[PDB]
Short mmCIF file of C-alpha atoms and ligand atoms in Angstrom, two decimals:
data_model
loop_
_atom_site.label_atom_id
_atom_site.label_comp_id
_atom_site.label_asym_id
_atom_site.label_seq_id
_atom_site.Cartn_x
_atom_site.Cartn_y
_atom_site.Cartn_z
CA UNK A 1 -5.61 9.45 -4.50
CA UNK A 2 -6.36 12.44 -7.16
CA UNK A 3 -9.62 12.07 -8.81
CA UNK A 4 -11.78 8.93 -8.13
CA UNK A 5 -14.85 8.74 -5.28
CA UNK A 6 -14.51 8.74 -1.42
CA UNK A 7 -15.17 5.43 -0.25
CA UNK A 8 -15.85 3.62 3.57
CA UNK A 9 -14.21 0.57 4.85
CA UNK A 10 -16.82 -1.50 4.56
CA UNK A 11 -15.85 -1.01 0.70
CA UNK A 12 -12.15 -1.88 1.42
CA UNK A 13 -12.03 -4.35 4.67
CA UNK A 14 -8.74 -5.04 4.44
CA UNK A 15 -7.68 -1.53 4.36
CA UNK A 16 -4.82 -0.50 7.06
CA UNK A 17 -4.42 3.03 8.37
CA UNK A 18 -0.60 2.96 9.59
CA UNK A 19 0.32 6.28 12.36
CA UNK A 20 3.47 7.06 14.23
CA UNK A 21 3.59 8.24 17.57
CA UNK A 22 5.47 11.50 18.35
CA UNK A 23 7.65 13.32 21.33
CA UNK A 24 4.49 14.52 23.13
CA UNK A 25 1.57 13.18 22.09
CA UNK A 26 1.00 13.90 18.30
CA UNK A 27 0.38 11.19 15.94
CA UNK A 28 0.73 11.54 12.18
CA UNK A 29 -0.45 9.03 9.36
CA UNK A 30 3.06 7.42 7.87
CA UNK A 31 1.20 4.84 4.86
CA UNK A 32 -1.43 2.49 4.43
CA UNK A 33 -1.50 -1.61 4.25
CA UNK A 34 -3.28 -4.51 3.64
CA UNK A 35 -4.25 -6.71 6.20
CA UNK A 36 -3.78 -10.67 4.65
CA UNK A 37 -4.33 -12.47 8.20
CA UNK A 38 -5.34 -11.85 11.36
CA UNK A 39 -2.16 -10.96 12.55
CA UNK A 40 -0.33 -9.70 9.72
CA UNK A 41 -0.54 -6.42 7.39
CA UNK A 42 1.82 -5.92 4.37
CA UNK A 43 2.83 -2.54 3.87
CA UNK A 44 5.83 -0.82 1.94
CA UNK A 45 9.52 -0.72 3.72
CA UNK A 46 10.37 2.84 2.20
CA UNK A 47 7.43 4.07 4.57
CA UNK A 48 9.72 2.74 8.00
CA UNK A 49 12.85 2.72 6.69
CA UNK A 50 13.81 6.24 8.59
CA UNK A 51 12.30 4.93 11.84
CA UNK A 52 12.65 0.92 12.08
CA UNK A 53 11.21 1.16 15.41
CA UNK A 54 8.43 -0.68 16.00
CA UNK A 55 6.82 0.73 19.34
CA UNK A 56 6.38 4.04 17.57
CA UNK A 57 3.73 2.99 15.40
CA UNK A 58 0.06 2.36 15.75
CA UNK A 59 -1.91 0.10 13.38
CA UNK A 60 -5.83 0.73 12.75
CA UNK A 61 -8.43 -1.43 11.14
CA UNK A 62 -11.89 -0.81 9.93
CA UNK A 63 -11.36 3.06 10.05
CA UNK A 64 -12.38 5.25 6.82
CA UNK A 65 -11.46 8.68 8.32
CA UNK A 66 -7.89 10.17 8.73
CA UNK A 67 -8.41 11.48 12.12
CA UNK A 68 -12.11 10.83 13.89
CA UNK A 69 -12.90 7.61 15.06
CA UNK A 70 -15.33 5.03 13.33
CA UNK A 71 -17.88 2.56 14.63
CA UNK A 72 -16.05 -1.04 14.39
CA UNK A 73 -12.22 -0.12 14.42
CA UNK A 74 -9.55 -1.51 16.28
CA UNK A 75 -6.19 -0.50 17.33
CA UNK A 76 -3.16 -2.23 17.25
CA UNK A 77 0.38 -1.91 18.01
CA UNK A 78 3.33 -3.29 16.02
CA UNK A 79 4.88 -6.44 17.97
CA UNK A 80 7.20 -6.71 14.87
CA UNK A 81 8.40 -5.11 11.84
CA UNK A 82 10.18 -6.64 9.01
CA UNK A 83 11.77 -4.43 6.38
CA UNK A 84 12.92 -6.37 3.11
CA UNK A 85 16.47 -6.38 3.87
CA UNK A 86 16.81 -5.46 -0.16
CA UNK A 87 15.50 -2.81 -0.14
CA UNK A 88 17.09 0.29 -1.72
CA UNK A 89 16.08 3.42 -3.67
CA UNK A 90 17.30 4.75 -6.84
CA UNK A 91 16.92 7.91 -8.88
CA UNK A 92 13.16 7.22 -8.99
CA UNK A 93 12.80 3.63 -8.75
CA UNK A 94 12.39 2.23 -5.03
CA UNK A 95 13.81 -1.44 -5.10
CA UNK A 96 12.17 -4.76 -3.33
CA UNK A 97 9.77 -2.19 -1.36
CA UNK A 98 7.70 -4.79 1.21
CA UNK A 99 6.88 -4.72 4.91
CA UNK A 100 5.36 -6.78 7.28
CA UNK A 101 4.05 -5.83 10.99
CA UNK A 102 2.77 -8.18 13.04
CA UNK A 103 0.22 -6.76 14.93
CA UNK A 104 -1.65 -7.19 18.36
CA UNK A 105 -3.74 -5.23 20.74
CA UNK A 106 -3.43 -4.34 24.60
CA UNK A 107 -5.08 -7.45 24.99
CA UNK A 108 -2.43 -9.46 23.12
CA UNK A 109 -4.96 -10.38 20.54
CA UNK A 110 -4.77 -10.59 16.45
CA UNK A 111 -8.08 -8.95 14.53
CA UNK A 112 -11.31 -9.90 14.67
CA UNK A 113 -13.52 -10.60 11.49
CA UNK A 114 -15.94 -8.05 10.80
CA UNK A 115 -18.06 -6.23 8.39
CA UNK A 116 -15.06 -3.73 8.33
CA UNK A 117 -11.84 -5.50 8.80
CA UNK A 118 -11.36 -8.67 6.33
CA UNK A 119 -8.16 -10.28 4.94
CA UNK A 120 -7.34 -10.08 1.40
CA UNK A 121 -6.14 -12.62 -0.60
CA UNK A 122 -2.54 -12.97 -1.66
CA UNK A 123 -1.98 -13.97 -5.72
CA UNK A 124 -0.38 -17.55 -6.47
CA UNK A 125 3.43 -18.31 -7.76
CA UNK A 126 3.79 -15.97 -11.01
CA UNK A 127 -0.23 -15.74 -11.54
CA UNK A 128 -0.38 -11.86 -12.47
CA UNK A 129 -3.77 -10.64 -14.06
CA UNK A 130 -3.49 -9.92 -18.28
CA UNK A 131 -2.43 -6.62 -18.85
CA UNK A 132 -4.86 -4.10 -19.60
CA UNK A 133 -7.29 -5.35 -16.50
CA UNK A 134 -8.91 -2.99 -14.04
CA UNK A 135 -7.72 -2.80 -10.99
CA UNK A 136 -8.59 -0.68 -7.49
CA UNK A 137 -6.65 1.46 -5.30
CA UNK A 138 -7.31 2.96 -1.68
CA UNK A 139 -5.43 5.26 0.39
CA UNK A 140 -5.57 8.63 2.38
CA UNK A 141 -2.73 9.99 0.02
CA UNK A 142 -2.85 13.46 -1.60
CA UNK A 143 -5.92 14.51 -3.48
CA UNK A 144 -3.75 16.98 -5.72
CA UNK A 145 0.27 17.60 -5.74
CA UNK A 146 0.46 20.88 -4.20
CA UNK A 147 -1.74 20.18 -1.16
CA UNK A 148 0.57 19.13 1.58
CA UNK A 149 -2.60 17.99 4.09
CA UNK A 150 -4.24 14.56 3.05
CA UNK A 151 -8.13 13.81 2.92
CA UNK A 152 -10.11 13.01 6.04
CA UNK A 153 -11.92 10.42 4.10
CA UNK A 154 -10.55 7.22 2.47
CA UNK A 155 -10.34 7.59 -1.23
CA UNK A 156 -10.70 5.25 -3.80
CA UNK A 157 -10.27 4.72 -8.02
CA UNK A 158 -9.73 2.43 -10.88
CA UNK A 159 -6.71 2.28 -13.02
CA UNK A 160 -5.75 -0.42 -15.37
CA UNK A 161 -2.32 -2.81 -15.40
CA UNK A 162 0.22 -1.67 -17.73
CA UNK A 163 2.64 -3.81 -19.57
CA UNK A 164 6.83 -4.18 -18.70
CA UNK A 165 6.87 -3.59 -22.08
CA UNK A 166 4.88 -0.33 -22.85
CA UNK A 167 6.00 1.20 -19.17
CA UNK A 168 10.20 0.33 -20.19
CA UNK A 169 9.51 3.04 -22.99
CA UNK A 170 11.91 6.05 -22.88
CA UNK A 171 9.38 8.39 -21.97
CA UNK A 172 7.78 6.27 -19.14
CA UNK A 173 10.69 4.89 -16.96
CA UNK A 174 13.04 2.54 -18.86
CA UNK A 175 14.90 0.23 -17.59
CA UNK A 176 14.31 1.49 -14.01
CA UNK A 177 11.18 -0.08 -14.06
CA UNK A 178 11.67 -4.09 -12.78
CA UNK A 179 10.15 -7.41 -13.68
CA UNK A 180 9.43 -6.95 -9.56
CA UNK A 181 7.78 -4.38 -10.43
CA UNK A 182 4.28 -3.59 -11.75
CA UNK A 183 2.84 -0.18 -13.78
CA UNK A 184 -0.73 0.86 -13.02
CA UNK A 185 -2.70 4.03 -14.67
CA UNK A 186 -5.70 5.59 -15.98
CA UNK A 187 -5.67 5.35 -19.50
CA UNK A 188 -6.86 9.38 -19.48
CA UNK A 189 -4.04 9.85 -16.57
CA UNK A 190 -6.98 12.19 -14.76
CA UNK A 191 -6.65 9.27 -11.50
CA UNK A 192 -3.67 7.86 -10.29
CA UNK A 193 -2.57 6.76 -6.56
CA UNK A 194 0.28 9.78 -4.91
CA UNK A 195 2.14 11.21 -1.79
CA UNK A 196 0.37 8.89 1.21
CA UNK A 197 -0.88 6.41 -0.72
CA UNK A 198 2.12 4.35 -0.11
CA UNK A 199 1.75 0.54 1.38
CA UNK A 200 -1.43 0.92 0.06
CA UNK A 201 -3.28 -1.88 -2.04
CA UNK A 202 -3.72 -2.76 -5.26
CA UNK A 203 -6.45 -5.26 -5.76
CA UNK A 204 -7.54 -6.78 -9.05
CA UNK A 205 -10.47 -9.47 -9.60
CA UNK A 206 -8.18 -12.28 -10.77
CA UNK A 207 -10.56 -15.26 -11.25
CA UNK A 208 -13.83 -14.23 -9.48
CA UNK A 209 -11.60 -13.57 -6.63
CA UNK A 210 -9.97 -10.23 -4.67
CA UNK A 211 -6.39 -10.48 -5.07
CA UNK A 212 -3.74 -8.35 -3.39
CA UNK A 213 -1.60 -7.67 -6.69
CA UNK A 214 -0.05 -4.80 -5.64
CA UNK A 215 1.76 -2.86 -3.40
CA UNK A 216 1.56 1.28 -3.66
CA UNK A 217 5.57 2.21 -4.68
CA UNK A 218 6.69 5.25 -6.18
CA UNK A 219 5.77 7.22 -9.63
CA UNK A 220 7.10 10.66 -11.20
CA UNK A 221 4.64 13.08 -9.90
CA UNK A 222 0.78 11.95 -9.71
CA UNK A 223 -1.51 11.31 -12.50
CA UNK A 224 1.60 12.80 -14.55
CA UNK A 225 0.98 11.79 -18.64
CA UNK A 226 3.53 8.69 -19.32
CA UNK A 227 4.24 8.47 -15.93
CA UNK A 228 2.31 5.85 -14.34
CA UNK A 229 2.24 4.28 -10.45
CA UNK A 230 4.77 1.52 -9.86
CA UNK A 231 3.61 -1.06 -7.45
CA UNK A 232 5.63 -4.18 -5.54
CA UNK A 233 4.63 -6.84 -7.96
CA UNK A 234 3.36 -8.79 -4.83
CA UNK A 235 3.21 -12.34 -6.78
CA UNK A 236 7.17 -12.67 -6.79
CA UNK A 237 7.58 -12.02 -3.25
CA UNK A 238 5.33 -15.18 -2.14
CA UNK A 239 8.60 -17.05 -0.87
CA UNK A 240 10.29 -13.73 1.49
CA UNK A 241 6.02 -13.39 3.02
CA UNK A 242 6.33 -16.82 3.80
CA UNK A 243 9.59 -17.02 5.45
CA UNK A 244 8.84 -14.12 7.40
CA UNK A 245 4.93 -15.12 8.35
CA UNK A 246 5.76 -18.53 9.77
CA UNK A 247 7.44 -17.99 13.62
C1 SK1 B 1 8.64 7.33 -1.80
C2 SK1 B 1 8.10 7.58 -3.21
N1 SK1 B 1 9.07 8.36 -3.91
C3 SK1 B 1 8.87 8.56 -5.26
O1 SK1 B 1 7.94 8.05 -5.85
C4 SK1 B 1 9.85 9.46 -5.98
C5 SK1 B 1 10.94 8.68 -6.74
O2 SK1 B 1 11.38 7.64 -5.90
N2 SK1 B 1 9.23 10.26 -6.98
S1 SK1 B 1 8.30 11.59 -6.75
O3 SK1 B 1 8.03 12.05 -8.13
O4 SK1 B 1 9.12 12.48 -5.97
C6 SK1 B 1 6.88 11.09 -5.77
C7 SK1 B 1 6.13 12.39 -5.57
C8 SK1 B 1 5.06 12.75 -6.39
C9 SK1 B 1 4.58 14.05 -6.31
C10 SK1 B 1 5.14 14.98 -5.42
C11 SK1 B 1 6.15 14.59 -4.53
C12 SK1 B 1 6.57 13.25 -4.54
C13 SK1 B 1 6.73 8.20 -3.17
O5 SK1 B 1 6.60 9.40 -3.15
N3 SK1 B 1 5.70 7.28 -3.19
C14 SK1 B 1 4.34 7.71 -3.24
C15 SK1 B 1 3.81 7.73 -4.66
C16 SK1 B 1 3.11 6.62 -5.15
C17 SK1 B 1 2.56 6.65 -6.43
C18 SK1 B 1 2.71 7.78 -7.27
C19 SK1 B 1 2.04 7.78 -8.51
N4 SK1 B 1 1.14 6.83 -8.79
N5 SK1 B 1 2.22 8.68 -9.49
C20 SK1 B 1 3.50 8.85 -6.83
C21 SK1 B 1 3.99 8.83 -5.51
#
């Protein structure tokens, strides 16, 4: 995240810190996610595409720092990971870019409600907040372009929904930018989401409610002028969540 405040996960419950194991014993954060039941966590599929295997990963809720434990967490593994079978990347734009992984722990459990891991709500059929509304994003991403180490603490800001219209313009993306697809930015482009901040959330108060509206995508740079985040417009990929979510 460049610019905006640190945060804890009591702030963002349904925050997901995604690792991958190494040859060794290293493990390095891959993205984040969003935990919408107990035993599922959306993420993005660009973030697993390289390594679709599942027993390589390691899933952890209700932690705020990159690398030091926190009071509350719990760690999962990945029983099974869906990739949108879609899913392709273009010049800049990343196409149908949704995971699930179906988590459980040692003891073959799902999470456990706490003050520091909640679900978040998905968004109904097509119901997609006015543009123009204020919306939050969390992540352990990059805190400025050229650093190439991410922040030990979870990061947080606001940035507001842009139209299809206004983000189709020639100097934002054109027509690489989707209907599928959603444009998020500050209107000063001083805070935007970056590098790690991928599978991510994108939650917007849609009717006195927390709604997961987005998904953390792609963008041209970070907090770039006309180039604003692009985020899995979650709300039109209600029927492929529920297909895969059932058994
Ligand atoms: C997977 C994806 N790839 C891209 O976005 C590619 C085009 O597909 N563009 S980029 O300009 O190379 C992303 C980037 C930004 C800054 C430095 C290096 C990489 C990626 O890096 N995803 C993370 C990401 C998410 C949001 C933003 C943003 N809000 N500006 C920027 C980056």
């Amino acid at each position: 995240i460049i610019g905006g405040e640190f945060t804890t996960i009591e702030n963002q419950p349904w925050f997901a810190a995604i690792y991958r194991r190494h040859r060794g014993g290293s493990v390095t954060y891959v993205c984040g996610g969003s935990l919408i039941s107990p035993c599922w966590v959306i993420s993005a599929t660009h973030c697993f595409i390289d390594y679709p295997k599942k027993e390589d990963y390691i899933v952890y809720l209700g932690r705020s720092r990159l690398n030091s434990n926190t009071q509350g967490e719990m760690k999962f593994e990945v029983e099974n990971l869906i990739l949108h079978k879609d899913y392709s990347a273009d010049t800049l734009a990343h196409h149908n870019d949704i995971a699930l992984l179906k988590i459980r722990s040692k003891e073959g459990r799902c999470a456990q409600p706490s003050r520091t891991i909640q679900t978040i709500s998905l968004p109904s059929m097509y119901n997609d907040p006015q543009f123009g509304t204020s919306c939050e994003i969390t992540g352990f991403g990059k805190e400025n372009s050229t650093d190439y180490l991410y922040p030990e603490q979870l990061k947080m800001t606001v940035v507001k929904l842009i139209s299809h219209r206004e983000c189709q313009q020639p100097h934002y993306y054109g027509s690489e930018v989707t209907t599928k697809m959603l444009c998020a930015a500050d209107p000063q482009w001083k805070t935007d989401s970056c590098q790690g901040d991928s599978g991510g959330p994108l939650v917007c108060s849609l009717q006195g409610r927390m709604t997961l509206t987005g998904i953390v995508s792609w963008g041209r740079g970070c907090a770039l002028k006309d180039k604003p985040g692009v985020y899995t417009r979650v709300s039109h990929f209600l029927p492929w969540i529920r297909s895969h979510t059932k058994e």
